[PDB]
Scaffold this active site. Sequence first.
Site, PDB file in Angstrom:
ATOM      1  CG  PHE A  78      46.258  51.617  -6.541  1.00 37.51           C
ATOM      2  CD1 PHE A  78      47.524  51.360  -6.051  1.00 37.51           C
ATOM      3  CD2 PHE A  78      45.455  52.528  -5.877  1.00 37.51           C
ATOM      4  CE1 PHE A  78      48.004  52.035  -4.950  1.00 37.51           C
ATOM      5  CE2 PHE A  78      45.927  53.207  -4.785  1.00 37.51           C
ATOM      6  CZ  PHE A  78      47.204  52.954  -4.314  1.00 37.51           C
TER       7      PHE A  78
ATOM      8  CG  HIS B  60      49.335  53.454  -0.461  1.00 32.41           C
ATOM      9  ND1 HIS B  60      49.713  52.171  -0.794  1.00 32.41           N
ATOM     10  CD2 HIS B  60      48.375  53.329   0.484  1.00 32.41           C
ATOM     11  CE1 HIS B  60      48.987  51.309  -0.104  1.00 32.41           C
ATOM     12  NE2 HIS B  60      48.172  51.987   0.683  1.00 32.41           N
TER      13      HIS B  60
ATOM     14  CD  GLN C  59      46.454  45.804  -6.561  1.00 37.28           C
ATOM     15  OE1 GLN C  59      45.543  45.504  -5.791  1.00 37.28           O
ATOM     16  NE2 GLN C  59      47.721  45.473  -6.334  1.00 37.28           N
TER      17      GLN C  59
ATOM     18  CG  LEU D 248      44.614  55.323  -0.772  1.00 37.34           C
ATOM     19  CD1 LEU D 248      45.655  54.507  -1.471  1.00 37.34           C
ATOM     20  CD2 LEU D 248      43.758  54.443   0.078  1.00 37.34           C
TER      21      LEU D 248
ATOM     22  CG  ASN E 149      53.066  50.083  -0.280  1.00 36.60           C
ATOM     23  OD1 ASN E 149      52.974  51.051   0.475  1.00 36.60           O
ATOM     24  ND2 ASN E 149      54.227  49.510  -0.574  1.00 36.60           N
TER      25      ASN E 149
ATOM     26  NE  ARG F 113      42.048  44.644  -3.293  1.00 33.70           N
ATOM     27  CZ  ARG F 113      42.640  44.822  -2.118  1.00 33.70           C
ATOM     28  NH1 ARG F 113      43.954  44.683  -2.007  1.00 33.70           N
ATOM     29  NH2 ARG F 113      41.920  45.146  -1.054  1.00 33.70           N
TER      30      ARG F 113
ATOM     31  CG  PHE G  11      39.160  51.660  -2.142  1.00 34.38           C
ATOM     32  CD1 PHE G  11      39.278  52.660  -1.192  1.00 34.38           C
ATOM     33  CD2 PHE G  11      40.154  50.699  -2.224  1.00 34.38           C
ATOM     34  CE1 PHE G  11      40.390  52.730  -0.379  1.00 34.38           C
ATOM     35  CE2 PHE G  11      41.268  50.760  -1.413  1.00 34.38           C
ATOM     36  CZ  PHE G  11      41.382  51.773  -0.486  1.00 34.38           C
TER      37      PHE G  11
END
Lengths: 158, 50, 290, 195, 159, 303, 55
Positions: free
Chosen positions: E106, E119, E56, E115, E95, E48, E53
Site C-alpha cells: 500500500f 507496520h 492498497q 502506521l 498487514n 482497497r 489515507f
Amino acid sequence: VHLDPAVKEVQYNPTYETMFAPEFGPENPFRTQQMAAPRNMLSGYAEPAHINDFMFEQQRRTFATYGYALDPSLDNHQVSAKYIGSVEEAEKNQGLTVFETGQKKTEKRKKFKENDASNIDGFLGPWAKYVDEKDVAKPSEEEQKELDEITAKRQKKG
Amino acid sequence: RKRKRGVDYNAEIPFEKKPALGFYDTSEENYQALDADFRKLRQQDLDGEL
Amino acid sequence: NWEDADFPILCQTCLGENPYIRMTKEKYGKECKICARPFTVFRWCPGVRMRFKKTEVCQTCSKLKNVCQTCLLDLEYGLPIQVRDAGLSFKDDMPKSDVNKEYYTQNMEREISNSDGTRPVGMLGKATSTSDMLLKLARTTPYYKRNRPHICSFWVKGECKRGEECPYRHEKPTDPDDPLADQNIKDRYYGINDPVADKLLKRASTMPRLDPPEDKTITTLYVGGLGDTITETDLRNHFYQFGEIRTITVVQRQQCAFIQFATRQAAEVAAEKSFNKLIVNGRRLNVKWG
Amino acid sequence: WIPRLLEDFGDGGAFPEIHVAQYPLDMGRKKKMSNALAIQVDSEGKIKYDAIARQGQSKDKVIYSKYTDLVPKEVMNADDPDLQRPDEEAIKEITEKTRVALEKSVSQKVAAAMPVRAADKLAPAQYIRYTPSQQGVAFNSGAKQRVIRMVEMQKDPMEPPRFKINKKIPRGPPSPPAPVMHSPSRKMTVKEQQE
Amino acid sequence: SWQPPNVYLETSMGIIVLELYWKHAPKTCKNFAELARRGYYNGTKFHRIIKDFMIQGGDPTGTGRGGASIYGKQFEDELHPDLKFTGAGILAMANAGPDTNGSQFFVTLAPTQWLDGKHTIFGRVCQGIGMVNRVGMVETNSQDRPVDDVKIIKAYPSG
Amino acid sequence: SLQAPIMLLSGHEGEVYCCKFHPNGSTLASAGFDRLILLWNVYGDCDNYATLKGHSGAVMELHYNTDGSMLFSASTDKTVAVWDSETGERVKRLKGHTSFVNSCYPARRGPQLVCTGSDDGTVKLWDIRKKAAIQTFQNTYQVLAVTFNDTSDQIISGGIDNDIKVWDLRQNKLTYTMRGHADSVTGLSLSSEGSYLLSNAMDNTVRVWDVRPFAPKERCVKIFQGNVHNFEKNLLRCSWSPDGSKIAAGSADRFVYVWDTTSRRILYKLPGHAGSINEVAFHPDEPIIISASSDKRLYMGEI
Amino acid sequence: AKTVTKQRVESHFDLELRAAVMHDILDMMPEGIKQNKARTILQHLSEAWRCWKAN
Ligand SMILES: [Zn+2]
Ligand SMILES: [Zn+2]
Ligand SMILES: [Zn+2]
C-alpha cells in the site's frame, strides 16, 4: 482468502479457510464506535433469534426476581459459558431460576384468611390483605407543609 | 393570529432548496446584508418607481 | 406518509438493565411529537420498578438528528441535541413552521427511502469530525433514574387511597422555581433553549483547555508530570507528526520537559491535541506554557 | 538528502528516513471543511463531469451526458448474438419474479376492499437478537447482546380510524434534471420568423 | 539473490516507478521483486483505496484477504527504528497483525502515527506521484472499494 | 459434488431434533419437536412424500438400520415407534420407560436389537419380537445418549454425570467408565468401523474415544473445539462421515462445524442457519451434508 | 378523479379540443420560434367555430 468480504448469501458451500480469514491491512481512522461496529440500522445489529420460549422467559424472570441471568450472546469472548448480572448472587444461590424449588425458605409474610364463604361481609378468599402493611399513605408531618408550599408556588404562576 | 400558513414567510425560507454543490468550495464566501437607514427609507423606495 | 418500521432506535439506559426484554409493537399507534405523522409505537418495561417507556418520535425524526426515540438524547454520546450541535455545526435547519416542516419532512423521507436506511443522512460527514469537549462530559454509566414512575398527584393532595399498591412515587416533586423544569419536547428536539443543555455547556465552559503562548513565537513547552519510567527517544516519534521539532530540553529532576518547534502554530497544536488528553506509557503527560 | 521543499522531490515520494514532517503534494494537516465534491477521474479517461449530472442519483443509474452518446453506431450487420432478446428461460424467470412482485402489492391494495369479513388473527410472537453497538461496562448490565420478544399489539375491531389523513402538502422536487442531448440548434432566418 | 533498483509499474491510470529500500528491509524487497518478475501482479487491481489515507494494491483474488508469498502465505516483519510513516508516496507492506505479511502493498498518502506504530516500511514511489494522486481520486463505497477497475497492467523489476 | 449446491429443506413447524441419511443415501427422513418425521427424496428436486405420524412427544432420536429398511425413532413420551421406510406404518412399538425417552439406537449386523435411555435413569435393551424389555440397567442420573458397538456386545451410555459408561450384555456390569468431560454428555456416535466413539458435551469440548479389546486405558484420543452450548440446553448430536475422515457436530451458535478426522482441523463452518443447530448428517456416498436446526429449515450443503 | 357524467360532457369535449390543438401547435412550430402565441391561435380557433355556427 478466496471470497469477497461482505456481499451476502453465497451460492456455493464455502470452506473455513475461504470465508473466515481476517481482512488484511490497517483499519481506517474515519469511523466512530457506532460506525466501526457492524450495525444494521443506526443503533446496532438486529437479527431474528429463535430462542425457546420457556428458557427465555425463565432467564427473564430470573433476572427480574433476583438480578442475574445467562448470556444470550452468540460467541462473545469465545468460551463455553458465563453469567451476566449481579454475578455475586448467582454463585451464592448456586444459579437457581424462578421455576425451580428454592434454597431459601424463611420470613413469610402474614395475612388474613376467612375461607368459608358463609359469613357475609366477612369473606375474603384470595382478596386477603396483609396484616402488617396498611392502606392510605398520608405522607409525613413536614412533607405535607412543603407540598403545600410547592403547590402555593405553582399557584403564583398561573 | 388564527391561520395555518402565512407566518412561514418571514420566519424562514418557505420551500427551501439548497443550491447543488460540486467541484468548487463555496463554504467560505458570504454576502453582506442591506443597509437599514430607517430615517430616509420609504415604502415607495423598496418597490421602486411605478 | 406512515412509517411502519421494525425494532425502534433506542439507547441503553432507556432499554433497561435486563438483557431479556418484552416489548409490544403497535402498527400506527400514536403520532410523532415533532412530525405529527403516525408511526409504529414500541412499548416495553425497562426493569422492575420502572415506568413502561415507549417511543415518542418517528424513525425519521431520529435519523435526521441521531437520537433515541424516547429520551431524545444522542445515540453515541448521550448528551442533549443543543450540546452536540454546540460541539459541532448546525447545518440541518429543520423548519419549525407547519407546512414547511411537512414539506421538508416529505423530501428528507424521500431522500431516506432513496438510500440504504442505515446512516445519518446529513449528519454523517459532520459526524466523522468529532471528539470535541462533548466526549469529556459524556456520561459513562447508565442513568436509570429517568425510568421512574411519576409523582402521585393524589399523594400531593394527601389523598392517595392506593397507598402501598400505588406504583407511582411518594416523594418530592421538583421545585418549579427552576429553569430546569420548563422543558418543551420541541425545544429539546430542535436545539432551542434547552436548560439541561445550558447547564451542560456551562459546565463545559469551566473545563480545562490548551492555551496560547504568553509571548510571541515561543514554541517552548513546559511539560509537567513526566515521570522517570519513560524515555525521550519515543517522545520524538509521538511528536514528529507536527513537523520538524525544534528544541527539546529535558529535565528529570523536576520531571519537566521543555520543547521547541519551528513555528508557534505547531506548539499551539501540540497543546490542543495534547492538553488534558494525551497519555503514553500508560502515564498522563501534562503540558503548560513557560 | 535534503527534502525541505516540494522542489527537491522530483516526482514525489516522501523519504521516510529523514524524520521530519515533509509531504510531496499538498496533503496539508489542516485541510478546512470544503464542500466541493471530489474531482474524481475514471480508470484512464477524462475528469468525470458526469458527477455534476448525478446529484441525487445512485451509482448504478445510467444517464447520458457525453458527445460519444450522440454519434450513431455502425450498421450491426446481421443476426448477431449481441442484439438478441436475452433468453426464453430468462424471460420466464423475469416474468415469474415480476408476477410474484406485483401480486403482493395487488393483495395489499385488495385488502382495503373488504376490511373485516373474517376479522384478523395474530400470534407470530417472535424474537430478535440485538447487538447494541454502544458497549459499556455497565450499560446492558453485563453483556454484548440482548434478546427482545416482540408481540404485535392486538387491534380493537370496534375502533374507528385514529388520525386525520386529508392533510395535503405541495409536490416536492423531482429527480435531478437530465441533460438534453439535442442537435445543434438548426438556424432560424428572419424571413421564416416573419412568415 | 540479486538487488534490482526501482520497479516499473504500469497501472491503468499511468506509469508509477517505485523506489524500494534494500538496506532497512531486504527480504520484503527480494520477495516483491520476485513477485514482480514472475508476473504475479499482471492483472491484479488496487482493491482497497481510501481517500487521503493510502492505496492498497496487489491481490490475485482482489478481495483484501487473499495472497501468498514465495516463502508461503506469511513471513516476519522488519520494524526498523529509522523508517517512519510521514508523508505521501511511502510504499509499504500490508498487514494482518504482528509478523504476518502476504503479497499486498500500500502506498501511504498522509503522515500517520499508528502506521509506523505497527507496520513495516517497504519503500517509496520515485516517479509518478501524479498518477498516484489520480488513483487517490477514485469513487468509493461503504467498504471503501472502487467502482471501476484501477488495475495494474504490467510490471518490471527494472535496473 | 452431486446435484447439490445448497438447496433448502422446509416443512417443519418446530425444531428439527434429528435427521439421518438413507442407508442408500438416495432418500432421507427427518423428525423433531413437531412430532412429525419428514421424508424428502434427496435426489431430483428434494421433495417429501411419506410422513410418519403416531407420536405424542418429541421425536427426539431418529435412526436407520444398516439396510435402512426399518427406521426406528425415539420420542419424549416414553414410547418408541418402529416404522419401515417403505409404506410408513407404525410396525412395532415398545413401551417400557416411566419417563421421557431421550435416545435410541439399533444394532446393525446381529439379530435385531434396540437400545433406549430415559430420564428415569435406566437403559433398556429391546428385542423387536418380544414386546417387553430384555435387560434394564439402572444408573441413578438421567441418561441422554446411547449407542451399541459393532459386535453387539456393549452398550455405551452418556448421561449427566459427565462420564460415559460401558455395559456388558453378558455380565450386566459396569465394564468401563470414561472420564474427561466437565459437564453433561448430549450425543454419542460410533465410527462405521467400530473403532471410535464421538461425544458432545456441555463442557465445551468434542471428544473422540477409542473402544478396543486392547485400549491405552486413558482413551482421550483427540479433542476438538468451536462447538458452543448455551441456556437452551438442547440435546446436541454429532456424526461420522461415511469414510470416517470428517466429524460434524451441531452447535447453539448456528454453525455447522466439520473437523478433519486425522488432523483435527475445522474443514467447514458453514452458516445459513438462524436458530441453534440440533443435528448434522452425511450422505453415505457423496459429500452432502444435511443440517437440521431449531429454525425449522434444512440445508443440503455440497462439498 | 371525477367522472364526465352528463353535465360535464360539453365542457370536457371543449377542454380536450383545446389540449389537442395545443399539442399540435407545439409540434407544428419550427425550431427557432419564441414559443409564445398559443393563446392567439386558440382565439382564432374559437372565432372560426363561431363563424362556422353563424355561417
Ligand atoms: Zn417523526
Ligand atoms: Zn433513550
Ligand atoms: Zn400514590
